[PDB]
A paper describes a structure:
Transcarbamylases are the enzymes that carry out this work, by carbamylating an amine using as donor the carbamyl group of CP. Similarly, agmatine, the decarboxylated analogue of arginine, can be used as a fermentative source of ATP utilizing [name] ([name]) in this process. The subunit body presents the classical transcarbamylase fold, consisting of two domains of similar size and gross fold, the N-domain ([name] residues 1–130 and 301–315), and the C-domain (residues 131–296), corresponding respectively to the polar and equatorial domains of ATC and to the CP and ornithine domains of OTC. Each subunit has a characteristic shape consisting of a hemispheric subunit body and a projecting tail formed by a C-terminal helix (helix 13) that is a characteristic and exclusive [name] feature.
Furthermore, our present determination of the crystal structure at 2.0 Å resolution of the complex of [name] with the corresponding bisubstrate analogue for ornithine use, δ-N-(phosphonoacetyl)-L-ornithine (PALO), explains why this enzyme can use ornithine. The R54G mutant prepared by site-directed mutagenesis did not exhibit any [name] or OTC activity despite the fact that it was highly soluble and was purified to homogeneity similarly to the wild-type enzyme (detection limit of the activity assay, 1,000-fold lower activity than wild-type [name]). Indeed, the determination of the crystal structure of [name] bound to the bisubstrate inhibitor for ornithine utilization, PALO (see below), provided a direct proof that [name] is able to handle ornithine as substrate. Molecular replacement with the refined model for one [name]-PAPU protomer yielded two trimers in the asymmetric unit of the [name]-PALO crystal. In contrast, in the [name]-PALO complex the phenolic group of Y233 is far from the ornithine and it interacts extensively with the carbon chain of Q50, leaving widely exposed the ornithine moiety of PALO. This loss of extensive contacts with the hydrocarbon chain of the bound ornithine should strongly decrease the stability of the enzyme-ornithine complex and thus the affinity for ornithine, as reflected in the much larger Km value of [name] for ornithine than for putrescine (1.4±0.2 mM for putrescine and 36.4±3.5 mM for ornithine, our own data; see also). A change in the position of Y233 in the [name]-PALO complex may also account for the decreased kcat of [name] for ornithine. In this complex the hydrogen bond between the Y233 phenolic O atom and Q79* is lost and the position of Q79* and of the 80-loop* is changed. Indeed, the abolition in the [name]-PALO complex of the hydrogen bond between the phenolic O atom and Q79* also results in the secondary loss of the hydrogen bond linking Q79* and H83*, tearing open at its center the roof over the active center, clearing the way to allow the escape of ornithine.
Author numbering:
A (entry chain C), C (entry chain A): 1 to 339
B (entry chain B): 1 to 146, 148 to 339
Write the structure that this text describes.
């Protein structure tokens, strides 16, 4: 048996709080130079169907820091998607690595990969959600809480396009009982199916959500978050197309930051298009935390990797008697046996 | 001095038996959570001219588990083939890594890579053979013996005369088993292939047959197949391979039943479901191709360890020089500043 | 605070001697089977915008041998250059790896990477220079000194095109007080800006330099070095064009080696186009050291990685009290808490 991390929908608020604490404890060790070897000799498979800096580097660095190794599987290097099915790739890699992640074009690909694998599977971003981004962002919001405010009393406003990141931020904030607002133009807002999911989260947590094109909605924001305008990796919008849709109403500039509040923090998942969704002045300003946010991609990924491997080991414990016997048997073989 | 693993033609049956035993001992250790650090701080170079999942991941996971590291060198990343010859690449990498593997478009590349390198070299598949697949398949058959001995078993390969087909021929006839290639005219193992299988058998007491007779599958303990689309660089179309192989060479439940109730299904993977094999067979109770994929890792761990142990035995470290060098570096780092 | 390795122009002769010595001491340890774990659990980011065998393999192997890991970031794998600016990539990776190297198309990219990063940055080759090649060639010339001669006693002649390797070799030889010659045809010689820098090196070092199309300039050389004729990776000179420029006058054949002197050594950064800049007979001959030179790409890279990380740790030391406290708190958490 095993557990996956495909969506935060299968995790309670309490479970996410455990993941934040675990991640932050590991972070404090490493920043002071103790590298806990919690994943010693473990191997991670890393399937990427799209380009990536933060997610990919975070997984490779995490494995090394914890005593294991991440294997990068680019497009064209593996047979998946043409000569081999998703179910076969899954069953095979279950025999070859200890834990698996994938960034996929279509959400169904990660669902199938997780369902057919006998080892833990992590979603590195699909067209539907970005759950490792969720934990990273939450870690970041915990570290940058406004003075005298609790997490659930905070207002988080996503500005612009209804990307997978926009939805994910909605899912995590509402899960933790916070107040979420998506400020976006008509035709590019979170849809009815998205909103019913936020509604289900809010009944349990006591949080709230709004989806609107009202410019005043930013007022009182403690966190202001944005993403790129050019859409999905495989079907980008042209510069001219996205400008007509979002510019200038949805550009996070200094006057918008001032409209939200003097203490409001700027967040972005990155990469950013400077001059489009955000100005140089904001992203490089004193209230930008999007570089601490990028650091926290690594923070959250270490905690998840450690939690899921701990979970797997508890469900599939090693036999220590058989372990010592096998060790002894290999050592005798190497001592006495020649080719 | 060194040893290579380019073809099992340079290995005796007894040597192949040792490699099996070593690989299985490592597997039982790791299965129970003991990772033997037998390749500590060693670097493997990995040249891939074609796509791979099982071979590539197996070498990377293998090195991590044993205390070392594998480096993936994909096409376009290195200058080999355009601005650099294979002999220079070989001489350069012999100075930069401890051990080398390559999956090549053409067999002469691995031959030349091995002969010019001063470090051990492994063939990760050519157009000619696939020797790490041979050891992995041998490990698999040992674990799934019918009660028969290995040398009493019949192994039928079904379909195209791929490099995997011939490699299975070589390993089975080397171990003294009974081999059949069941394939259509024009796509059978050729006269040069068969002469090598014949040389193996005269030594081992095994047997071989190349035929298009469907009754040849009867009594098979293992029934093995591969894809129909040929070489990576020049694939056969969907319409053309169907005309060549379908339905005669599709491994379906009728064929498995004709082989025998206890016949096991093997396939090197990736498989084209609905072509060389049906969903029913590959997902069925008698399919062992996923155990077989696991054993690509098993066999590769054993090979890396053997070849490095052999290398170390032939080029041993001077422990007096080792301690003197260690002391000198420590004195340097303690006392000297930029 | 940190230090970079972008150009040997920021390093004194005494500093370069230290680096050679460190690299040679590490080399002798590893050659005899002792792997010093000087970079335990550290991560190196490797940005490659061009193809590479020696530089890429040296970095990955170097990290494994010293206890760390190198991460390969190829073209198309990261969004830098299209959807992300050089400055943002630098600040982000500063949070995700410990040390960074890049092979860049344009020299301004490595300068910007280094200037914006809070971690050490190594130049893995640009269109301007190639400083890890410089240190490798220095280690190589030290190991192959003529009897009774010092490095500063030696005459080094570079043959052919004014490549970045040509200029770099000029920089490192003049820095160390040696006698450097560029033997190249008019229009393809080191320009006035290059020569002015060599002249300034010579004022301090006691060395000398000459740029000439005179064939007799090879006479009395202790090392004879060459490179390809096809120019830059992005803008290659065709076979017919380059042959018309250089062939046969600038081909390193046995006649040129004999003209240089019986004991003269042949050097080449590689890869070599046999039949163009050099013949089979010379590169495969008894006086060829280019494969030893290739080995010393790894020799020099190990020394550089260690020095820069030691420098960083000295400037940014870990606090051992906070380290132990962080270790204990993590250990307590894993013992007592569950999801
Ligand atoms: N809406 C964006 C989301 C990017 C999220 N960014 C990350 O995960 C950081 P990375 O891509 O460098 O890993 C898109 O669809 O591209
Ligand atoms: N005849 C096939 C052989 C593939 C063997 N499969 C493997 O080695 C598994 P891999 O490709 O995932 O490493 C071909 O030439 O393509
Ligand atoms: N003038 C040459 C310099 C190549 C240097 N070679 C190396 O650094 C060895 P590598 O490319 O294998 O890393 C060019 O611009 O191509
Ligand atoms: Ni690696």
């Amino acid at each position: 048996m095993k557990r996956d991390y495909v969506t935060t929908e299968t995790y309670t608020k309490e479970e996410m709080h455990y993941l934040v604490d675990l991640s932050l404890k590991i972070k404090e060790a490493i920043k002071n130079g103790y590298y806990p070897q919690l994943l010693k000799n473990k191997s991670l498979g890393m399937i990427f169907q799209q380009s990536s800096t933060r997610t990919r580097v975070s997984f490779e660095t995490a494995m090394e820091q914890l005593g294991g190794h991440g294997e990068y599987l680019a497009p064209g290097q593996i047979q998946l998607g043409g000569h081999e099915t998703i179910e076969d790739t899954s069953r095979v890699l279950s025999r070859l690595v200890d834990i698996l992640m994938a960034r996929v074009e279509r959400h169904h690909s990660i669902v199938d990969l997780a369902n057919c694998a006998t080892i833990p599977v992590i979603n590195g971003m699909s067209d539907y959600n970005h759950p490792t981004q969720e934990l990273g962002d939450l870690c970041t919001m915990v570290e940058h809480l406004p003075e005298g405010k609790k997490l659930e009393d905070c207002k988080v406003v996503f500005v612009g396009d209804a990307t997978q990141v926009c939805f994910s931020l909605g899912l995590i904030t509402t899960k933790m009982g916070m107040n979420f607002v998506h400020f976006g133009p008509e035709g590019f807002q979170l849809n009815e199916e998205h909103q019913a999911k936020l509604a289900k989260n809010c009944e349990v947590s006591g949080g709230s959500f709004l989806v609107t094109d009202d410019a005043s909605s930013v007022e009182g924001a403690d966190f202001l978050y944005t993403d790129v305008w050019y859409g999905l990796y495989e079907a980008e919008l042209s510069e001219e197309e996205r400008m007509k849709v979002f510019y200038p109403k949805y550009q996070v500039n200094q006057e918008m930051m001032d409209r939200a509040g003097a203490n409001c923090k700027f967040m972005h998942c990155l990469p950013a298009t400077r001059g489009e969704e955000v100005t140089d002045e904001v992203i490089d300003g004193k209230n930008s935390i999007c570089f601490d946010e990028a650091e926290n991609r690594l923070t959250s990924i270490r905690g998840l990797l450690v939690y899921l491997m701990n979970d797997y080991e508890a469900k599939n414990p090693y036999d220590l008697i058989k372990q010592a016997e096998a060790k002894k048997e290999l050592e005798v073989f190497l001592d006495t046996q020649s080719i």
